[PDB]
Amino acid sequence: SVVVISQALPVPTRIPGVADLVGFGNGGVYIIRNSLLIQVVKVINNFGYDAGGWRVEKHVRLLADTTGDNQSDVVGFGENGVWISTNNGNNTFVDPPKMVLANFAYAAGGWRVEKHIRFMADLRKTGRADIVGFGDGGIYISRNNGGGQFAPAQLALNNFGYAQGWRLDRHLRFLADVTGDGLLDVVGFGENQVYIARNSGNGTFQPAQAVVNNFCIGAGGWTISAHPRVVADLTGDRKADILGFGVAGVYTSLNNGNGTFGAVNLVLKDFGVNSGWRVEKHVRCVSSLTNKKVGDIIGFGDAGVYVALNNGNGTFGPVKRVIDNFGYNQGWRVDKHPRFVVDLTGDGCADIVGFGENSVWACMNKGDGTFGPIMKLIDDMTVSKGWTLQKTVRYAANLYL
Length: 401
Ligand SMILES: [Ca+2]
Ligand SMILES: [Ca+2]
Ligand SMILES: [Cl-]
Fold this sequence. Notes:
Helices cover 0% and strands 35% of the residues. It has one domain. The chain has strands spanning 4-5, 20-25, 28-32, 41-44, 60-64, 73-77, 82-85, 98-101, 117-121, 130-134, 139-142, 154-157, 172-176, 185-189, 194-197, 209-212, 229-232, 241-245, 250-253, 265-268, 283-287, 296-300, 305-310, 316-323, 339-342, 351-355, 360-365, 371-378, 393-397. A hairpin with a 4-residue loop joins strand 14 and strand 15 (194-197).
């Protein structure tokens, strides 16, 4: 499906695609290129816990194409500014990184991981990722003007900021195209309403408008600790819908096609609190698993991975356990073992990857939402090889096409 940026998954992956694995480890940045040779390559002696002083609680580390050549660069929101290591095209990156803007940082603009959100996104159809932050006064953007030149930060909209009452412990903020013009709009699950703000394509967003009185902490009792929510295309028209894992199960509100939204319906009595799903034990994702290229539901539960396939119209088929692994009963832990649903094979049907206690493992989609056997990738980038979730960042990312 289509480009959505969320707090949980700030580095989108392509469908179809052959995603790479990237690790910000103790010693710097390491990649596992998706290829016939599976190996770890150290590419930058920076952006690491010891190699550079990078901290999850102070800094943000992402991958984004900042030049327009469809190669992803490493972008870090560091201590005193934004630092970028560009992709050299050959599984190497520039080192040291370049400081492109003294803003959006812990000691340049007072940015705080616990109050603010920092993304990279092509907001103006230039082919290059601009810097986008949900800061104190609103949403701020720094335009990527090319050749590493980022312009001084401009206020894009005086909303969705900490000053307006937006809180990471209560609310959710996304970027997603809800209108179909290819521009990423803001979607914010506020106190009482889901709000959208249309991207005008010029570095600003239009005034926020409420679309749904549900999916929020004050409207339906949706909490961060218990009820995950996503935005995703559930019908194939490339416009994002709203999906939440609530108490009884999965609730949706479908986009009418113009950024207006339908009623909230319970579409599947599974994957919710009443079926025993718990944010601290389980992982719940929406990704395309089939040739319909719509959002299907994937849950890493107790006994393994469970999937319900979208019929193509936002209704769902039966829940099936597709692999007896990657689950809580197999020792997988949200606090220790990152798990992703991403295309690793290029067929457009997302696959599973997880960074286990000892090894990285994958399980490949057969093409129809059913899965093959578990496969070992490599014995690195794991707990026992010195990667603790709290001192490292790991992503699936398309470094190259
Ligand atoms: Ca749009
Ligand atoms: Ca695949
Ligand atoms: Cl710095």
